[PDB]
Amino acid sequence: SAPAQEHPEATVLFSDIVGFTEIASRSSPLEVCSLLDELYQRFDAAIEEYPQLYKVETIGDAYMVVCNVTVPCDDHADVLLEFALRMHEEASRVASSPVRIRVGMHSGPVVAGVVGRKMPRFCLFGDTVNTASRMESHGEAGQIHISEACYCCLRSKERFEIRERGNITVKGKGTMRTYLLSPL
Amino acid sequence: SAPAQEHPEATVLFSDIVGFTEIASRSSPLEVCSLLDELYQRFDAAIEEYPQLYKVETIGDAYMVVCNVTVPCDDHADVLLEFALRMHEEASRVAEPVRIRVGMHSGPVVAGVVGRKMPRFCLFGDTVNTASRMESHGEAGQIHISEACYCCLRSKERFEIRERGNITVKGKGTMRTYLLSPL
C-alpha cells in the first residue's frame, strides 16, 4: 500500500446535525442512530454525482468530505462547495420530529494514507483537517461556514454570492476571517 | 450485516498525544504523521494481547478503544483500564519521549455498520462523546476516568485510582472524575 502523501492543496468539509442532543432527547438511541444513518444514506446517494469527492462518516457523528486528495482537481473548493449546498437540501429530505445541518469548509495542505493492519483505514491528517472541523462546529445552523483559505481557492467566486463575513478562533491560532453562505 | 444494537454497558477510551502542536510546529507534517503511525503500530501491537478490545484510529488523530461491544467481557472497565496503563508504556518508547492523555467512560453504546461501498463499524452515542471529553478534560501522562467507569471497575483494588473531584465537562454539567498515574 503506497506511503502517506501530502496533497499541497485540498478542500475538506465537515457537516453535523443541528440540535442533535435535543433530537436524541426525545428519541431512542437506536431511533436516533437510524435517523443518523438515513441522512448518511442521502449524502452517499447525492455524492454519486460528485466523483472527485471522498467521504467518511466519523466517530462523533460528523460527516466528512474531501476534494483533490482522491483525484486531482484544483477546481476542488468549488465542487466541494456546491456539494455543501446539495447536502443542505438533502438534509431537509429527511425529516425527524425536519433536519438541519451545519457545514464548515477549509483549504490547505492535507496528508493522506493508510493506518491499521488487520483493520486498515484511509487517513486524512493535519492542520487543514482540524480547522475544517472547527469551521463546522463554530459555524451557523442551516448555513455554510467557509474559511478565507477556502474562499480564495474558489476558481468561480462569482456565482456563489458570499457576503457575510465572520471570524473563528479555535484555540490553535489567532483569529481567521471566514465567510457565511446561506442556501436559500 | 446485522442491524445496530445497543450495548447496555461498555467502556470507551480515547487517547491523544500531549502537546502535539508543539511537536508538529517544530517539524514536518509527513514526519509527524509518521510519529503518529509509529505510536499507532505500538498500540496496535500491544492490543493483540487484549482480544476483548476493539480499536479505531479516528479522523481527528485520537486513538479509540472500546470494550464489551465486540466480545462479551464483564470486567470491561478493568481490562480497558489495564490496556490504558499499557498505552502509556508503549508511548514512552517513542521519541524527547511522547506523552499521552487518556480518558475513559462507561455506559450504553450503540454499535452497527454505516456506509455501503465502504462500510465502517460505527460506535455512537453519549457514552462515546463523554469518554472523549474525559480525554480532553484529563491530564498529560495520566488516565482520567468518570465515576461511571469507576463504578464498573470490578477490581477497584488493583489500581491506584485517586479521586479527582467534581469538574464541569463541556455539554455535560458537573461530573465526578478519578485519576490514575502510570509508572
Author numbering:
A (entry chain A): 467 to 563, 567 to 653
B (entry chain B): 467 to 561, 566 to 653
Sentences from the paper on this structure:
Here, we report the structure of the catalytic domain of a soluble guanylate cyclase (CYG12) from the unicellular green algae Chlamydomonas reinhardtii, which shares 40 to 50% identity with the soluble and membrane-bound guanylate cyclase catalytic domains. The 991-residue full-length CYG12 protein contains each of the domains present in well-characterized soluble guanylate cyclases as well as an additional C-terminal domain of unknown function, and has the full complement of residues necessary to function as a homodimer. Each guanylate cyclase domain contains a central seven-stranded β sheet surrounded by several α helices. The two monomers in the wreath-like dimer are related by a twofold axis, and a central cleft, formed by the dimer interface, contains the two symmetric active sites.
The three C-terminal residues of each monomer are disordered, as are residues 564–566 in monomer A and residues 562–565 in monomer B. The final model of the guanylate cyclase dimer includes residues 467–563 and 567–653 for monomer A and residues 467–561 and 566–653 for monomer B. The model also includes 8 phosphate ions and 99 solvent molecules, and was refined to 2.55 Å resolution. During refinement, we observed unexplained peaks in electron density maps around five of the fourteen cysteine residues in the dimer (Cys 499 and Cys 592 of both monomers, and Cys 621 of monomer B). We wondered whether the apparent modification of the cysteine sidechains might be due to the addition of dimethylarsenic groups via reaction of the cysteine thiol group with the sodium cacodylate [sodium dimethylarsenate, (CH3)2AsO2Na] buffer and dithiothreitol reductant present during crystallization. We will focus on one active site, and refer to each domain as monomer A or B. In the C. reinhardtii guanylate cyclase described here, the catalytic residues are the metal-binding residues Asp 482(A) and Asp 527(A) located in the β2–β3 loop and in strand β1b, respectively, the ribose-orienting residue Asn 599(B) and the transition-state-stabilizing residue Arg 603(B), both located in helixα4, and the triphosphate-positioning residues Arg 571(A) in strandβ4a and Lys 640(B) in the β7–β8 loop. The modification also results in distortion of the β2–β3 loop that contains the metal-binding residue Asp 527(A) and the base-recognition residue Glu 523(A), causing it to adopt a conformation incompatible with binding a metal-nucleotide complex. Comparison of our guanylate cyclase catalytic domain structure to structures of the mammalian adenylate cyclase suggests that the guanylate cyclase catalytic domain is in an inactive conformation.
